[PDB]
Ligand code: SF4
Ligand code: SF4
Ligand code: FCO
């Protein structure tokens with residue numbers, strides 16, 4: 060009712076590639092989203108306020124009479140009482156816990172917030188955790204490293220206008236993550252024909268042969284990359300490079316070595 | 322003028338530092354309205370170097386790329402260069418060209434986003450834009466920038482109307498509690514300039530999308546490219562006609578915006594804030610160089626970089642030394658790492674996290690303190706610009722002088738936060754001037770021969786270094802391979818150089834030193850700190866990794 064729904068966006072143990080991915084949205088562009096559609100009430104990467112003023116901005120949002128939706132970017136470092144990841148003098152885990160409590164809904168943008176991400180890879184020095192594990196609540200997961208802005212903004216709009224979209228067993232919206240990368244790969248006929256590139260310099264590579272022998276995890280990865288592409292132009296396999304499985308939980312340890320199927 | 326300055330004596334802490342990548346806490350002691358001491362305190366550790374141990378050297382680039390998604394690609398590039406050196410492979414010409422073009426696209430995206438979406442709000446009072454007459458603003462735009470429909474009175478009125486409806490809603494979103502709300506003594510721009518800058522801010526939100534699309538044509542996607550492999554690149558399609566036509570078409574759009582909006586906006590602002598040419602200067606600059614015509618080895622990179630490598634000490638532009646990779650080391654005395662880690666060359670790098678407490682003056686950052694022969698080094702656009710300028714690189718010489726003239730300032734005025742800010746635009750313009758040449762070179766080459774990846778063998782035992790000058794400066798990845806696995810992998814990252822803590826001698830880092838002498842108009846709203854901090858374009862995820 061003229062009011063724009065309030066969104067609070069927290070950055071935890073992250074590389075900001077998810078923030079970057081979100082601003083690549085074109086349906087709508089980010090300016091339109093935050094001017095017309097939502098009220099982005101806290102976002103460290105782009106917000107004007109700093110320090111105490113930024114902290115008051117957050118607290119204002121969390122106390123908003125209309126409530127807010129929470130977007131979480133990054134995993135949660137839990138070692139030493141959460142002190143290896145701090146904002147404004149407070150452990151990230153403490154602040155996310157507090158924001159989550161009264162959130163209308165929680166969207167984890169990226170594999171880091173969904174599942175723990177890169178900092179959780181062995182030997183996990185910071186004892187990093189995904190949000191759901193850390194807080195003990197169900198989250199809407201938009202994984203990928205980073206996810207397609209199509210998937211995130213798609214989810215965001217769905218949540219605000221329609222409700223919680225149907226989620227797969229790992230909390231991923233089926234609209235976007237319901238299909239294997241491999242099932243929509245243009246190189247699928249080569250895979251079917253057992254026509255694999257043995258190396259990146261091979262004539263087979265030059266001819267666009269399947270990349271499975273080079274470690275492609277397309278066959279075990281749920282994402283929509285070949286269908287929707289990135290940046291309206293490309294995706295990794297189109298660029299001659301195997302899928303890393305970057306939308307699968309704990310892929311840093313389950314999908315490695317990246318150049319093998321072993 | 323002169324520069325607004327309060328009488329404030331006491332500490333100021335700014336945490337979070339917003340409009341950067343990552344988690345930074347700045348602590349300052351102010352005396353009589355000027356900063357007398359500073360501390361750069363990085364607030365997040367992830368530990369990629371620890372994570373990489375024992376892994377397949379081929380995997381490194383995928384792990385290290387996640388050091389940062391703001392400067393996406395650069396770590397993948399540095400890791401691939403690093404591993405290429407360790408296995409002693411020389412990438413094909415096409416791979417060198419493609420890798421360098423992607424870097425170029427990264428510069429364009431990165432500098433455009435930083436200026437507008439990270440930096441401008443320190444200089445530009447957006448709410449003041451609502452006071453501007455759009456006809457007065459259109460006229461002023463004609464007098465400070467090239468003709469473009471985006472700067473018309475109608476186009477500036479529409480922006481103002483969009484902003485007004487936004488502000489009138491009561492939901493300020495990302496402007497909530499801005500330091501410029503209600504006016505601020507340290508914001509000088511006329512409302513007309515605020516309107517112009519704000520119009521471009523919104524345009525740049527669209528333009529960065531195109532910049533990222535151009536990059537993804539060669540890189541597979543953005544953020545987080547996926548086209549580099551040991552021995553070169555995978556992206557044969559990135560050598561063909563239509564994709565390269567589209568790549569050039571998108572880059573020309575981006576470059577038109579750099580020239581029509583970014584530089585003019587930068588110079589306009591620079592003109593109003595000329596006092597900032599005497600604030601936030603440092604003494605030593607280091608660059609590994611970038612855009613080499615020969616990337617067969619780190620030594621060839623250093624020597625053939627078209628943005629040249631070099632070392633300036635004590636602002637002495639008459640003496641640019643060669644880079645000595647053996648003289649790089651990192652200290653941890655004032656960092657959150659175990660005692661005994663000081664003075665390590667990155668090949669002998671140690672990453673042993675040890676947290677103490679917040680604002681502990683003896684241990685106050687998750688960043689290491691990189692030093693060169695004992696000296697803190699500023700890296701990034703300003704370092705590159707000075708080094709290129711001192712060396713008489715013709716494009717840098719021309720552009721620096723265009724800037725020094727327009728601003729009627731001596732080159733020594735560039736040793737400052739204003740210079741640092743301006744340097745970033747200077748190099749953006751030069752990348753832009755080089756794109757079509759570079760693209761044409763690769764198009765012609767890939768047409769003749771589409772070789773993109775070289776044959777190579779994994780050695781049992783070895784070491785290598787991958788150098789790059791990322792958008793924020795001199796980046797190096799250092800690998801030791803033992804049993805065909807990662808034995809040691811160390812990243813030494815531009816923000817580590819710039820925003821790290823004190824070294825083992827208690828010597829301040831570049832940002833810490835730059836902050837000394839910062840005037841504080843309003844201690845409640847210390848934008849001046851942000852101006853200097855933001856000028857280094859900090860990336861804490863990069864710095865700490
Ligand atoms: S999911 Fe990937 S891109 Fe997103 S914050 Fe984590 S490492 Fe960065
Ligand atoms: S390249 Fe990957 S996703 Fe495509 S067919 Fe081969 S294994 Fe499947
Ligand atoms: N540019 C950039 Fe990121 C930092 N600091 C890297 O490397």
Ligand code: F3S
Nearest residue numbers: 282284302303304305
């Ligand atoms: S690596 Fe990730 S972006 Fe898509 S192609 Fe594979 S899921």
Ligand SMILES: [O-][O-]
Nearest residue numbers: 391392860863
């Ligand atoms: O950005 O580093």
Ligand SMILES: [Mg+2]
Nearest residue numbers: 811812813866
């Ligand atoms: Mg390091």
Ligand code: NI
Nearest residue numbers: 389392860863
């Ligand atoms: Ni970065």
